[PDB]
């Protein structure tokens, strides 16, 4: 795989420039969708608004190009918002450092300049992130906007009303230590985006069917071991009365509500039918964690040790059916904070992008929480950004200040490919935007509603501070590992 | 190696209209009084930059003869008026392009003729209904100033532009004759002196 | 396009042709003068209809409206009578033409 | 980008082209020899599209649309993929225009909805039930083929089921769940009977009594199976509970019944049943109430069936059925006892069959109506025309171009008639204009006049769902930017 | 043809652009092998002379060089650089649609920010107000960079100082005459007042004359006919035997029967001088140009003093003292090669030029790329204020401006990615009166190192470049 001193970093640049504009036009609440083909034999014609799925579903070979995958697959799990804009200012600062190559500038240089750049556009970001009195005084139109903001080219146009309401619940009393067992998702086929409502239950009811009592007080649950039931044969009757004698040993304790995770056929089923315990089977991780958490049904291989006292404790739990469906209420929890989000969608693709926007919802609100702290949206705050370092490259002597103004250059791009992908004249609107701000400070920003520009306060359309500091920083670190490689065996 | 000279009726009217449509959308973009002017290059020895529609179609030189007809025309209304080549040619390019769509549609040529000199009746009647013209522009010294804006708004010569105004109305002054209304070519106020 | 509209077959589409064909000259006029070819044409348009004031063009000199009263942006009714009526004949005429013939034919 | 923007839109018209002179009563049929020696006979959109070979994705969303909209209503297969090709085409100008597709697909929202608006406002609705006009739908639907002679059999009996019952499903809209279909080979055409609840067509064998009043039922799906631990359980169990009239299911083991078991399972001589389909094993389940259960064990008293009366008599003769009435929730699909010696008198009575029941749910799911023949495309690219000349901004191009593209479905229909298109279809649109909405083509009598005289007459619905189809998936091909392979 | 004719003008620039500054690249003046052996000049005004152009848009270019040229100063290489900066930049923008009429109005508003900005930042020499030589010194050593008469430039700066009161009455340049034979060295210089014609005659003419009143010749059995008109013209010499002239131009070719009697008569025959040196006469002197003298007898004569011949230092140095103004300064050279004579004569007309505009207009702005870094600054701050695309506009602008001195910097040899960017940052700061020095290759304030140019000339630069660029950009075929 021996390569030369200038095509490996070319060729290396050229691949992530390329990831780039892959994601370049899914931008925006106006973003260009695009199919994911798997060619094969019957590859599903899939597509999406979402470029971090697109991420998640590229195949790159480039080292380059696996560099600014992984960095995207930490911003995703991070935040979960934000990754194509990473990576498109990745790849606008790594074809800024292409251009600058061109006219023999030392990478290093320009590494050097980058750095102090973004400690200017972090600390004006600082300098500029209004705190306002949504997490201080309780404000609800803050939370509004920024769940709307992170909702946007969705389905659930309609009922983001309850998931802000529950966004303001959580920020009044599921703020335990920054709760994030709460993101429950579970939804069906059939029907519309308007099905939005409450739950806090797992969508399993009792196997044995609609005999066993509905309404059950106490609850000691944990995951069983075998399959019940009452020299193959001789091992097997044996076993099958130490086993009874094993669950003898257990059945002092009058569980009602417990889960078995290896499978359950008619046998077990009736042996705890008439021991009066419920199965579920291979049940979500995410609903054993919150089983183990919120009620207090902890994860285990055996039951062994606990024998007296050492069982999980409920409060109430309770299954019915409800709406011609799966539908399973666990009302009287330890405590409320696993609000369930439940939704019956159309097709499957819901499923995924529904749990996926509102996982980035909770983590964003969590992110404002955390720090109330916030930042005008819609290209605001990314020109509010390039104008400070603008100024500091121009009160900033070297080689390093043309580094400095590719790395604005890089910054207001951002905008532009935003603009883009709305089909109104970006370079217009951003000139405008920008000549603007630099007196017409960050007051003013982008409006997409009318293809005009605005006073983006007065929409209030607002991105929490976190997420913007964060991908800032992701971005410029990215850029600049990449950039300080020049030239290793490194591609065919 | 199996060339052939035929032309059906048909792809003729296609050929022709890509005729049309090469050398109007050529001169298209000097419409307007901010249009891209032309820089005419003589094939031997000249060069030249002019943005008057009727001077480039001039000087150039089309094979195409229904280009060479269409340019030898104008040709002709340049004489008549010498204003609105431009629009004359850029229209007449915008028919033809338009009714390629048309042609391709099965409709025969016949009927798209009647049907636009029937639609050109209605625009003529149409606009001699709105005109809010004034009739006073006979003693109109000070209107006679601007009204000549637009054709000298193009350059820098605003400077001194009301001078020439003055001079091209004392000129009219001069020879306003109220029956025929008409200068001849001795009259011509033509002479190019260099420098100054 | 009015008239298009109480129209025999062929002549309405002809003249649904001859409408979008007239629409060519604001269309070459913002263009020229940088602006959207085709945005500035269809707000004007749509400005031209809401108002009666037939007076409402493209301003290519981007002063203040699209009303060249003020800006004395005029023309005779001679001049464009002709310019319309030979377009027409030109496009009439280069229709009715199907066939060119050279002799010294070289096939 | 662009580059492959074209490519879409290529491969979309080209596939829709493919089927383009297909659609209207004298459609012409194709024959493609793309496979391995397919004798390719039809006129039906359908089955050609789903037939053609699918490599782009442009043409898998139209055949997507095609299954949508047959699906959705069962009419105008055809019709929407034509619509689309000719959005498609008509947006190619724009794009080349230089409109960013997004533009586009706003407009084409907006148009969308003012077309679905002035389609129903002023359209023909049925207001009282009025049977009388289903009927006639259906007769022009159901007749000018082999099935025309047999419409007065197989038309009122569907009218019959839909007003058993009036199923409250899609706003009180009697949906595929009337009374479940059953239909067996042989007999005549003139044997078509209805039914009330569950009925089995299975062959059944039983030289005893399978004929009680209580008839209790049970699904056991666990049958006999090659190793007496789970062979003979099954038996008592039955004989406990006391069931006479249980189907048989082979998904254990195709020895089902063995000798021995069919003689302990003789001395109750308990009702024999296989071959079921599986998609009728949850209707069944539903339709009787007890649960789709494969455990013997897990099989007790509560599985115990509702039935009134069970008969294996010999209906129509030769016809060997077991009806059974007043079950829990009966009512799977809409009954037509398809019998007949004939081969024909069986597929094309199903499939009229099939036709009817979708034009008669379609009325129902909206009760208004119009008038085909290419009037409502006509209605559409007149009044969507002159939207764009109210509508401002600079998508009231895309809105004319999508009004205009609108025209294809009346000059196709009257080319397929013979006449000259673009004359008898700007005729149509002068006399739509100066007239009234109803103007159409008249196709299988030689003229254009207006529908008193044909009154061919279609739901509202098939138009609205293959005009909003048609718009959507023209909006989700134009945001198409880029198709990545190697996933 | 917009790219066919954006890459020949670019090309037109490139080829001239190595020759900026006090460093420039040498070139090769080649043709047909057939009189191409080797013709070598730094500046690059006289590349363009000597270029083959094809591109029409390229001859538009060289043509407005040429006016540059011919016009006040040289300037003629940075407005050819500027122009293809410039059409450089309208391709890059226009590669990303933005249509010429916007980049247009853009640069004209950019533009005229420039030159306000460089009005506001001009200084008034001394030398017109409380007479200073140094102002002058530095005035006339910028123009003259790149070359090497450093020895006797005091006698260029002499010529130079005197010209304010005696050698102009508005600006006048035709009375300075430059003439040089071969053989010599830097210590040649002088001053003298006249041409270098000899006698024909002999040695028995005396040096010294009376009085001259100059003129111009007429004219130079078939038998008959040619002794009849040889009595005519010894008739016409006879006449001018009487009209006591003693210098005389002899347009036409006199052989020696008719010299002879001319010298006899006290006319001397200077056969076929320069109009040139005829010229110098007619304005300081007062020998007007006529076509024949049969008719002037006694009003229609010239006009002069004194006129003597003398031989000085091995060649005939003939020196026209004592004629009516004594504002025909000539200076009198001894160079070695063939290109001294055009070198010398094209410096020392340019820096007499820019002279006669410093002591027309005594304002002056310092030079060395700080006038252009601010009017890069002011083009750049108009830039951030006002919406609409042409902000693309006026930031080209300014890059080609900050791109002007950085072919100065690459053409001395230093870096340039550093202290033009050093000169940019600190341009806000360190002001006007920095600027940029190839004596050490850093930045200094550059009030100090003294060296300025003069603001008309430089004015007229950033005039010609805007216009021929915007010239070019508007057309688009053909
Ligand atoms: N209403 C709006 N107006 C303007 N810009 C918006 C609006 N809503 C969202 N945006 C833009 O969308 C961007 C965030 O979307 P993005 O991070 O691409 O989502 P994802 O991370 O899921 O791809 C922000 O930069 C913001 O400027
Ligand atoms: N100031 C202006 N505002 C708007 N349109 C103008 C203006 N000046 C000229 N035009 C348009 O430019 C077109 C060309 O005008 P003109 O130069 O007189 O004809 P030609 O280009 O054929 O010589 C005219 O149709 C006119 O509408
Ligand atoms: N007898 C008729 N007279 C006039 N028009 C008809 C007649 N029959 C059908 N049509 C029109 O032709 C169209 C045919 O629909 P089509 O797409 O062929 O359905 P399918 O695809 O199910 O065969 C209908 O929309 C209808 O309006
Ligand atoms: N000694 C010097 N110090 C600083 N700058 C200089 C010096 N000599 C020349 N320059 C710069 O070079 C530019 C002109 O260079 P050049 O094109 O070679 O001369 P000309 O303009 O006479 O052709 C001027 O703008 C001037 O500022």
Redesign the interface.
Known sequence: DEERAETARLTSFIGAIAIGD?VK??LGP?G????????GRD?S?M?TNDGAT?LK???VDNPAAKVLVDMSRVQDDEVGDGTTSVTVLAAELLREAESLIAKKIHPQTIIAGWREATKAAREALLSSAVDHGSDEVKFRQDLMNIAGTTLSSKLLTHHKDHFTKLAVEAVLRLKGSGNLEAIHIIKKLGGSLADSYLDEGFLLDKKI???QPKRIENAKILIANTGMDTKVAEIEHAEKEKMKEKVERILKHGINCFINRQLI???P??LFGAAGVMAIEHADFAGVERLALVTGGEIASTFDHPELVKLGSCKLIEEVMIGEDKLIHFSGVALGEACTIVLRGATQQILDEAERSLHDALCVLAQTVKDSRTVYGGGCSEMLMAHAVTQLANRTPGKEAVAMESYAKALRMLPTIIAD???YDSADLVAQLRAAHSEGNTTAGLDMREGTIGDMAILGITESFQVKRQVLLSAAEAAEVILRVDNIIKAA | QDRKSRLMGLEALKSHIMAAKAVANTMRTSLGPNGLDKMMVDKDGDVTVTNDGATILSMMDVDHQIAKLMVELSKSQDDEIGDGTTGVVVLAGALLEEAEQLLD???HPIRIADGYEQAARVAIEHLDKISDSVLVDIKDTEPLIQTAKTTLGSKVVNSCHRQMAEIAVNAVLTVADMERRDVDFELIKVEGKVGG | ?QEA??????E??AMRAFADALEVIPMALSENSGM????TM??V??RQ??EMNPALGIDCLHKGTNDMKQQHVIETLIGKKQQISLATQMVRMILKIDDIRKPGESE | ?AQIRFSNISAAKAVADAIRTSLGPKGMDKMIQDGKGDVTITNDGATILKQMQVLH?AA??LVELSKAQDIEAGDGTTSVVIIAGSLLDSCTKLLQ???????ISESFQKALEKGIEILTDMSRPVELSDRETLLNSATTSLNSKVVSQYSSLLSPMSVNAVMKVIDPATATSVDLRDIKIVKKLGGTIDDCELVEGLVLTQKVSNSGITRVEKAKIGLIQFCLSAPRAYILNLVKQIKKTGCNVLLIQKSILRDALSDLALHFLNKMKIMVIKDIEREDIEFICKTIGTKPVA????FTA?MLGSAELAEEVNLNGSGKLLKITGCASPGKTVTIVVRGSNKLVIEEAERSIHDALCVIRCLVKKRALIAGGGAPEIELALRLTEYS??????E??CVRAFADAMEVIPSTLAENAGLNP??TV??L??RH??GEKTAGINVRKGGISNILEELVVQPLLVSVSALTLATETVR?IL?????????
């Open positions: 892959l036009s899914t106006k260009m969708d695009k199919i994911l083909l798997s060619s590859a014609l597509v697109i579903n590229i195949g069917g609609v005999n056929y008619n046998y089923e009736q992908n709305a089909g | 549609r099965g409709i | 396009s509209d109480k129209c025999p077959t062929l309405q589409y959207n070819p085709i945005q269809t707000e348009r749509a209809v809401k | 980008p994705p898998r969303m225009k230089g409109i960013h597709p997004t533009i455990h013997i064990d897990q509560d000349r109210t509508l401002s901004g600079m009231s191009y673009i004359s700007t005729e649109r002068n204009a100066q989700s945001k198409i930017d880029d198709v990545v392979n190697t996933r």
